[PDB]
Design a protein around this nucleic acid. Sequence first.
DNA 1: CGTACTAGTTAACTAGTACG
DNA 2: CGTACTAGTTAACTAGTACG
Lengths: 104, 104
Amino acid sequence: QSPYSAAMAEQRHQEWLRFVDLLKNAYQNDLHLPLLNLMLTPDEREALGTRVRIVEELLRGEMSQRELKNELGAGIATITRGSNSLKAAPVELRQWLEEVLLKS
Amino acid sequence: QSPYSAAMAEQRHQEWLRFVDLLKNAYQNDLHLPLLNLMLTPDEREALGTRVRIVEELLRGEMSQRELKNELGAGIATITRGSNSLKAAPVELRQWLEEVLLKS
DNA sequence: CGTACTAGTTAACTAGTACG
DNA sequence: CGTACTAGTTAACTAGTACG
Ligand SMILES: N[C@@H](Cc1c[nH]c2ccccc12)C(=O)O
Ligand SMILES: N[C@@H](Cc1c[nH]c2ccccc12)C(=O)O
């Protein structure tokens, strides 16, 4: 009896993270932006602004349900379906989401 | 006309950067992955996946224009229109592309 | 008070061929 | 031999209302 893969690494990284390695070369300076004008599009930083704005504004929960859609212009399907993604993720790394709002 | 500084206007984009400061908090550890599962989508690693595939395979030039389409499945309009993006970018920061192509 | 949902229109990307 | 084009389809995202 002998296991195939278990010691050192359990999950294998093939695509999304070899991209996060070149991102840390332009994150020390700030050259991942002319790099994003060659491999992706302006529509990727258009959907980062309004998507990161309904989550950064929902987690506060003061004026974010009926009265928020008029300020930016993002429907009630995106503002409350962004809430459905929070209940699927785990709590050990939802905990880091608290490490980046609370300010420690 | 002027020895130092030419034309005064001042301009800054605040959307992709509210996402780059919180991305640097999870880049020191590695919690930007549960982060990409609740405010990005699985199509955001399918676009960083296949878009980093036609550029990292075009810049070398071995099997990335005609014989590539069957190996993964992206069509000839993405692997040849991705070449048109390089002709628009500048050489001062395309130079950093050499800082991460030669070494990587 | 809050959420979920039913109806409403837009956007990128994919695939095999045409010519320089 | 290396690029770009004609024709083909596959997902994403907006908006305003009603019920628990
Ligand atoms: N994964 C997101 C999908 C999404 C696309 N565009 C959005 C804009 C805002 C919020 C969420 C989204 C969700 O279902 O929640
Ligand atoms: N700006 C890119 C947009 C793009 C979308 N999907 C792609 C796939 C591969 C390469 C580029 C892309 C282009 O037109 O080239």
